[PDB]
Structure formats: C-alpha cells, structure tokens
C-alpha cells in the first residue's frame with residue numbers, strides 16, 4: 001500500500017520522526033493549527049504536533065574536554081547509555097566552552113573539536129535522542145576572548161560579532177545533516193544581562209542585533225529550516241521598563257509582548273522561558289500563578305508568530321527534594337499543552353550545579369516524573 005499521510009499515520013510525532021522510512025524535514029518545524037483566520041503557531045516533528053518533556057544535560061558535549069580532557073567519547077557514551085535507559089526523548093546542552101580560558105579546546109585544533117561534536121550527534125542519531133545545542137552558553141566568553149567590551153555583541157563590525165557568525169557557521173555546518181539536532185538555540189539567558197541599572201553592560205536592542213545576526217546566519221546555512229530559538233529566561237518583570245525607563249516597574253502585558261519581540265526577533269521563532277520558583281507579575285494583570293503565566297506566555301507567542309517552550313524549570317536539587325515543587329511544573333505544562341519542557345539538570349556524575357545523576361533519590365524523582373508525563377503527552381493533540 002501507499003504510505004498514509006501524516007495525519008492518517010497513527011504513529012506519534014517522535015515515533016514517525018525516528019522511523020526508518022522517515023524522509024521528511026529534519027528537526028522542529030513551525031506550522032499552525034487553523035480555526036478560520038486564527039492561526040495558532042505550533043511545533044511539529046516528523047510532520048505531526050509535538051508534545052514532549054525532557055532534560056537539560058548541560059555538559060553532554062563539553063564534558064568531552066572539561067572532564068575527559070581529550071575531546072574523546074568516553075563520558076559521552078556513558079551519558080547516552082543513561083539517556084536511552086531512562087527513556088529521555090529530548091535534551092538541551094551547551095555547544096561551546098563556558099570560559100574563554102577553555103576556548104583553546106576549539107582553536108588548538110578546530111577540526112578535532114568539531115569531529116567530536118559530529119560524533120556526539122551521530123551517537124544521538126543512532127540512539128534516537130533529540131538534542132538542542134545552545135551555542136553561546138556563557139555570553140561573557142566571546143567578548144573576553146576577543147578582548148572587547150561586552151556590548152560589542154550588538155556591533156556588527158566587532159570581532160565579537162564576527163566570531164559569533166564564524167562559530168555559528170562552524171556549528172551549523174557540522175550539525176545540520178543530523179536528524180538528532182532538532183533546534184538551534186542562541187545561548188543561555190542572554191536577556192538577563194541587559195539594561196541592569198547597577199550592573200550596566202548591554203541593552204536589549206544590542207542583544208536583539210546579535211539574535212538577528214545569529215538567526216540570519218543559521219537560516220542561510222540550514223536547508224531543513226528547523227526551529228531557531230533564543231534560550232532566554234523569563235523576561236524580567238520590568239524587562240521593558242528597564243530598557244525604556246531604567247526602572248523596575250513591572251511591565252504591562254502589552255509591554256511584555258513588546259520586549260519579548262525584541263528578545264525574539266525576525267527569523268528566531270522559538271520563544272524560550274526558564275521557569276524558576278519566581279512568579280510573573282504584570283502591572284495591569286497583577287501577580288500570577290504558574291498556570292496563568294504559561295497561558296499568558298503562549299498568548300504572547302501566538303500573537304507574535306512564535307512558539308513557546310520551557311527551556312529550563314525547577315528540578316529536584318533546587319526543590320531541596322520536595323517532589324511537589326517539581327510536580328507543580330509538570331501539572332501546569334500538561335494542562336496548558338506546553339510542547340517542550342526541559343528540567344534542570346542531568347549530569348552523568350551529578351557534578352554540575354543544581355543537578356542530578358541517575359540511580360539516586362533525586363535522579364529517580366526527575367526521571368519518574370519525566371516518563372509519567374511523556375506518557376500523558378504522547379497522546380496529546382490540538
């Protein structure tokens with residue numbers, strides 16, 4: 001028989017994506033579910049609507065030189081074995097050295113470093129692990145390496161901005177052929193560095209310029225046009241007012257959409273937030289619980305043509321072992337049909353801040369919840 005259409009396919013998104021007969025676009029695609037003129041932007045994988053929960057594995061790649069010291073695969077393979085055994089479907093990881101003092105692991109021999117990254121992606125292909133590289137994890141590091149002030153991220157003529165383009169090109173060219181790579185994320189929590197009155201280093205508009213240059217370069221190189229994401233935390237309550245007035249006045253909802261747009265520009269359609277044990281407050285709507293915060297974030301995303309995801313949220317070590325604190329996140333994300341949510345943080349040896357490892361009480365707490373909620377997500381549709 002002729003194979004059935006994507007909607008006629010009874011398999012799930014991840015199952016259809018990872019099947020041997022899949023020959024569709026790689027990575028997360030943005031489509032829309034339509035009711036008349038209403039187009040709700042939504043994530044697709046394997047041509048079906050995606051709903052999944054996974055983990056951060058911050059050091060999935062960088063452990064190859066930060067821990068193993070040789071750009072080898074010893075710890076990577078041990079880590080992937082755990083991810084497979086625990087049934088982790090999706091992982092976010094850092095795709096660059098945290099410190100400029102370790103940039104030599106790339107520049108000493110660029111082809112060796114990129115070969116280890118290619119190998120990681122190949123291992124994830126074979127083991128059916130979807131990964132999201134977060135390319136400029138610590139935004140301090142590139143300006144430091146270039147002996148430039150941090151604001152040069154927003155200056156297209158700077159060595160910092162050139163390095164961003166050159167490194168983006170290197171990563172995308174290495175990874176674009178791998179079906180495990182499902183999205184490209186700029187870096188980690190860049191928005192939190194902007195417009196701080198008593199720590200004044202960069203403006204939201206400068207960050208936006210870097211995001212726009214990143215997204216344009218990725219779009220130029222990636223024939224699969226998979227999701228380009230920010231890696232932002234939540235916007236600060238006052239994110240817009242810090243930029244425009246240098247004040248800590250909580251933003252209105254309209255101002256939140258505005259500043260979200262600055263921090264998710266152009267071709268960057270992945271609206272990341274990180275959900276800590278902190279509430280969202282609007283000057284007009286007030287202080288909200290997490291359910292209403294997610295509903296408001298998804299409403300902002302939809303209006304902007306973006307898709308929301310929770311790139312980090314509270315894990316067992318941050319919760320001091322209170323499973324109810326963690327469970328509250330999963331309850332909300334399932335109820336509000338959040339399409340990707342990633343708990344902080346799995347580390348092979350548990351040696352990353354606020355992280356868990358396998359076969360411990362905190363590890364089991366996280367992985368049991370992850371499996372429990374992927375079982376519920378696995379039938380979700382809209």
Ligand SMILES: [Cl-]
Pocket residue numbers: 059062063064066067
């Ligand atoms: Cl490490």
Ligand code: NA
Pocket residue numbers: 350355356357358360361362363
């Ligand atoms: Na642990």
